[PDB]
């Protein structure tokens, strides 16, 4: 191929063919001249070498090289090696009618639709717009339609909205580990340049909103459109194919909202009140006359399919909080009332969705998930739950425990210095002492953090579960666990070594306090190892999955 400036670009096969032809012609010339046998034998060896390098370069004496010092690519090298036709172009190839962009949240969406930029939609659906413009007479020819879309006339946007009406688009994220990495959504034209992704599907994609990008493809044929609508739609794939559990469970902020709403405290506004139903509960809460955590009695009516699908109703006076009664207004008919009569952490919500799916069906569950998401977001916002430094309450008896551990380890060390215990025994003894100290510190921290005193209906002390923001996040399943809180407010703990051993002396400082420069080096020791192990695990898992799909 010619390039600009008289320069050319060529394949390596031209050089190999030229060499073969040159040596063949020289051999014919030598046979013509009746040369001595030595010369013709050498020429024949050279011809053999040239042909074998043409067919396959590497597997012989070294390998011929070009003008630069890289080996020439032979015919065989063009078929194999992960850069050949079999694996580089015949199974994975670039496609038209595709785009990519960053992703944002768009919490207002419904489970079956996604927000698509208007300019991306205009570029992707261009032939459809030309067809619509010509069909309705707004353009005489396809050239006129092209000019109209290029100038972005007013009618072009109406035509685009008509074209996009019911036409799914496949969204995909690069590490496609399972079949839920590609899903079909209905486009919703938006401004800007970022795709909006429904929160509930994020876990399916394993996607967050800190810089991730997604690719969008558009089906063309009627069969492709119907497959996207009936097979790949996001409202069809709500159960995991690995196990029958749901995979659209609310993740972190919905869980916090629903946990805060469904939760009781000892003494709140309007305790002991008797309500006529959920609507009166919501009216009282919004009027400011009652608290969202107020133990009242509410007249609840619940339906049951205790027949051949009849939904018989039962009305009673339940004992619940205002928040639970308010939340009951989104639950469908057939479900009982005991599902929403608890704290509703992370697992309770998943169990509730699973029960809804198994008792009622698919469409009610799809509506229920959206209602759950909206309510959780709304009430998490309304709670105003934040995080401060004073929320990380360190035990008041941590220093005493550390002093006790130090005294015991000093005793063990001086005992060893007197030749009563061997090195291994004393090392194990010190490890055990520090482990016990860490366990005691963690127990004290958690016991101090998981309860609070509130008074009262009459004026007496009464314990209750704490409303600490850190504890609420950890306990509801929204985010965090015991280890994170231990590191924040307990002691960072016991570290390891590059050898894999355990350092006898632990990091006795948490992150609310600071780690001195010597304690912060042992942490860097382990962070690097963590990152390297993550990379290695990704590579190994990919290789295993490829070998596993090859066989089956």
Partner 1 sequence: VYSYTEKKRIRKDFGKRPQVLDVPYLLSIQLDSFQKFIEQDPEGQYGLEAAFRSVFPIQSYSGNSELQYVSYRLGEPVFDVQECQIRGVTYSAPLRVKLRLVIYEREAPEGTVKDIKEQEVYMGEIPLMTDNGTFVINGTERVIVSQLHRSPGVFFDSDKGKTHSSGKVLYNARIIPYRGSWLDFEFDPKDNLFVRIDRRRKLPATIILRALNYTTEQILDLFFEKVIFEIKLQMELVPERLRGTASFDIEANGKVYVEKGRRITARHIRQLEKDDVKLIEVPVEYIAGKVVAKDYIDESTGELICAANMELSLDLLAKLSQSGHKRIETLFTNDLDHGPYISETLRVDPTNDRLSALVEIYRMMRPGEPPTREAAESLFENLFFSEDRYDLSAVGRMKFNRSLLREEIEGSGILSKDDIIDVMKKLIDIRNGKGEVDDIDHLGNRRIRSVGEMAENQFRVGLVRVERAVKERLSLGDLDTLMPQDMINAKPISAAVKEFFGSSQLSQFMDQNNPLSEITHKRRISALGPGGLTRERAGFEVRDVHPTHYGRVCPIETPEGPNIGLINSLSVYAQTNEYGFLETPYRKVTDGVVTDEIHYLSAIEEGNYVIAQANSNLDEEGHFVEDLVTCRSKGESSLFSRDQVDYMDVSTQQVVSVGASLIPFLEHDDANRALMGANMQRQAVPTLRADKPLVGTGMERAVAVDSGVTAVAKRGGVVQYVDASRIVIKVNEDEMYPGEAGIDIYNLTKYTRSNQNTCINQMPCVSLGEPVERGDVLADGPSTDLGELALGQNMRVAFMPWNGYNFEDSILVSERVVQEDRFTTIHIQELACVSRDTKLGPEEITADIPNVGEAALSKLDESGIVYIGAEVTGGDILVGKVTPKGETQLTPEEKLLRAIFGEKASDVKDSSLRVPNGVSGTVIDVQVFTRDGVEKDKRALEIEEMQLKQAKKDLSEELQILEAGLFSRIRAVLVAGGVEAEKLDKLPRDRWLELGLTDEEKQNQLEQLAEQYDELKHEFEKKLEAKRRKITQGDDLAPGVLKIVKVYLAVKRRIQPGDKMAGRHGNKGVISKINPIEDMPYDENGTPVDIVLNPLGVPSRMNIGQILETHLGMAAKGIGDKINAMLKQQQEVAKLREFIQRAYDLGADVRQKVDLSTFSDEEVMRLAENLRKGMPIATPVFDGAKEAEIKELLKLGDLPTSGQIRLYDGRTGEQFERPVTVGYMYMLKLNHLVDDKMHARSTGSYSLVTQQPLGGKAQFGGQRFGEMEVWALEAYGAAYTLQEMLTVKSDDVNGRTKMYKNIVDGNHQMEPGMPESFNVLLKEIRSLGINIELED
Ligand X SMILES: C[C@H](CCC(=O)NCCC[N+](C)(C)C[C@H](O)CS(=O)(=O)O)[C@H]1CC[C@H]2[C@@H]3[C@H](O)C[C@@H]4C[C@H](O)CC[C@]4(C)[C@H]3C[C@H](O)[C@]12C
Binding-site entries for Mg(2+): 208, 210, 212
Binding positions for Mg ion, 191-220, rule CB under 5 A = 208, 210, 212
Q: Among 127, 310, 312, 361, which residue sits at the site for partner 1 (rule: CB under 8 A)?
A: 127
CB of residue 485 to Mg ion, shortest distance in Å: 24
> Which of 306/499 has CB closer to partner 1?
499
| Nearest to 470, CA basis, from 480, 461, 483, 462 | 480
Burial of 29 (0-12, 13-18, 19+ CB in 10 A): exposed
Binding positions for ligand X, 6-35, rule CB under 6 A = 7
Region near ligand X per CB under 6 A, out of 1-9, 212-220, 277-285, 538-546: 1-9
Chain residue at closest Cβ approach to ligand X = 4
Q: Is 187 in the site for partner 1 (CB under 8 A)?
A: no
Q: Among 31, 220, 407, 455, which residue sits at the site for partner 1 (rule: CB under 8 A)?
A: 220
Q: Among 32, 210, 396, 458, which residue sits at the site for partner 1 (rule: CB under 8 A)?
A: 210
72, 15 contact by CB (below 8 A): yes
Residue 246's φ and ψ, nearest 5 degrees, are -65, 155
Binding positions for partner 1, 158-177, rule CB under 8 A = 170, 172, 175-177
Residues 247-286, one symbol each (x = binds partner 1 by CB under 8 A, - = not), give -----xxx-xx-----------------------------
Q: Among 61, 92, 137, 419, which residue sits at the site for partner 1 (rule: CB under 8 A)?
A: 92
Q: Is 3 in the site for ligand X (CB under 6 A)?
A: yes
State both tokens at 303: 């339906």
- Is cis: bond before 456, omega within 30 of 0? yes
Region near partner 1 per CB under 8 A, out of 73-81, 275-283, 331-339, 394-402: 73-81
Applying CB under 5 A, the site for Mg ion has a residue count of: 3
Applying CB under 8 A, the site for partner 1 has a residue count of: 135
Burial of 385 (0-12, 13-18, 19+ CB in 10 A): middle
Q: Is 134 in the site for partner 1 (CB under 8 A)?
A: yes
Applying CB under 6 A, the site for ligand X has a residue count of: 3
Residue that is written with structure tokens 């005793």 in the block? 411
One-letter-per-residue 3-state SS of 403-471: HHHHHHHHHHHHHHHCCCCCHHHHHHHHHHHHHHHHHHHHHHHHHHHCEEECCCCCCCCCEEECCCHHH
> Which of 9/549 has CB closer to ligand X?
9
> Residue 386 binds which one of partner 1, ligand X, Mg ion, none, with CB within 5 to 8 A depending on kind?
partner 1
Beta-bridge partners for 310: none
State both tokens at 436: 């016990």
CA triple 217-222-226, angle to 5 deg: 75
Q: Among 2, 4, 38, 90, which residue sits at the site for ligand X (rule: CB under 6 A)?
A: 4
Q: Is 76 in the site for partner 1 (CB under 8 A)?
A: yes
For residue 407, the tally of other CB atoms under 10 A from its CB is: 11
CA triple 332-335-341, angle to 5 deg: 100
Q: Is 390 in the site for ligand X (CB under 6 A)?
A: no
> Residue 17 binds which one of partner 1, Mg ion, ligand X, none, with CB within 5 to 8 A depending on kind?
none
Cβ-proximal residues to 51 (8 Å cutoff; 6+ apart), any chain: 20
Q: Is 396 in the site for partner 1 (CB under 8 A)?
A: no
Q: Is 390 in the site for Mg ion (CB under 5 A)?
A: no
> Which of 343/495 has CB closer to partner 1?
495
> Which of 67/524 has CB closer to ligand X?
67
Pairing of strands 312-320, 296-304: antiparallel
Residue that is written with structure tokens 């493809």 in the block? 217
Binding positions for partner 1, 521-540, rule CB under 8 A = 521, 523-532, 535
507, 479 contact by CB (below 8 A): no
193, 117 contact by CB (below 8 A): yes
> Residue 3 binds which one of partner 1, Mg ion, ligand X, none, with CB within 5 to 8 A depending on kind?
ligand X
- Interface with Mg ion by CB under 5 A: which residues? 208, 210, 212
Q: Which residues bind ligand X (CB under 6 A)?
A: 3-4, 7
């Amino acid at each position: 191929v010619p390039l600009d400036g008289g320069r050319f670009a060529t394949s390596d096969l031209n050089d190999l063919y030229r060499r073969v032809i040159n040596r063949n012609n020289r051999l014919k010339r030598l046979l013509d001249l009746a040369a001595p046998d030595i010369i013709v034998r050498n020429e024949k060896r050279m011809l053999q070498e040239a042909v074998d390098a043409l067919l396959d370069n590497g597997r012989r004496g070294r390998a011929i090289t070009g003008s630069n010092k890289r080996p020439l690519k032979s015919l065989a090298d063009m078929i194999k090696g992960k850069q050949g036709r079999f694996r580089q172009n015949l199974l994975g190839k670039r496609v038209d009618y595709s785009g990519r962009s960053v992703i944002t949240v768009g919490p207002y969406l419904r489970l079956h639709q996604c927000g698509l930029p208007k300019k991306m939609a205009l570029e992707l659906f261009k032939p459809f717009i030309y067809g619509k413009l010509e069909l309705r007479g707004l353009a005489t020819t396809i050239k006129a339609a092209k000019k109209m879309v290029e100038r972005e006339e007013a009618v072009v946007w109406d035509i685009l909205d008509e074209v996009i009406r019911e036409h799914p688009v496949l969204l995909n994220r690069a590490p496609t580990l399972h079949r839920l990495g590609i899903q079909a959504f209905e486009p919703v034209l938006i401004e800007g340049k970022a795709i909006q992704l429904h929160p509930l599907v994020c876990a399916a994609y394993n996607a967050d909103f800190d810089g991730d990008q997604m690719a969008v493809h558009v089906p063309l044929t009627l069969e492709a459109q119907l497959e996207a609508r009936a097979l790949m739609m996001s409202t069809n794939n709500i159960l995991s194919p690995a196990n029958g559990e749901p995979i659209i469970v609310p993740s972190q902020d919905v869980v916090l909202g629903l946990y805060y709403m469904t939760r009781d405290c000892v003494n709140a506004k309007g305790e002991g009140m008797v309500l006529t139903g959920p609507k009166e509960a919501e009216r009282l809460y919004r009027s400011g006359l009652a608290s969202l955590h107020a133990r009242v009695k509410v007249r609840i009516t619940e339906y049951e399919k205790d027949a051949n699908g009849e939904l018989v109703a039962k009305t009673s006076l339940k004992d619940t909080t205002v928040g639970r009664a308010i939340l009951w207004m989104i639950v469908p008919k057939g479900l009982p009332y005991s599902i929403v009569n608890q704290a509703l952490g992370k697992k309770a919500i998943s169990k509730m969705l699973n029960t809804c799916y198994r008792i009622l069906g698919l469409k009610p569950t799809v509506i229920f998930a959206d209602q759950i998401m909206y309510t959780g977001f709304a009430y998490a916002a309304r709670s105003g739950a934040s995080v401060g430094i004073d929320d990380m309450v360190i035990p008041e008896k941590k220093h005493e425990i550390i002093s006790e551990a130090e005294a015991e380890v000093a005793e063990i060390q001086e005992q060893f210095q007197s030749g009563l215990v061997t090195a291994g025994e004393r090392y194990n003894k010190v490890i055990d002492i520090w482990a016990a100290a860490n366990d005691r510190v963690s127990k004290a921290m958690m016991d101090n953090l998981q309860t609070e005193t509130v008074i009262n209906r009459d004026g007496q002390e009464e314990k209750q579960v704490s409303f600490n923001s850190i504890y609420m996040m950890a306990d509801s399943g929204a985010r965090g666990s015991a280890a994170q809180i231990r590191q924040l407010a307990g002691m960072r703990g016991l570290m390891a070594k590059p050898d894999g051993s355990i350092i006898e002396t632990p990091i006795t400082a948490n992150f609310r306090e600071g780690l001195n420069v010597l304690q912060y080096f042992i942490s860097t020791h382990g962070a690097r190892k963590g990152l390297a192990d993550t990379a290695l695990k990704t590579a190994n898992s990919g290789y295993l999955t490829r070998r596993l799909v090859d066989v089956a």
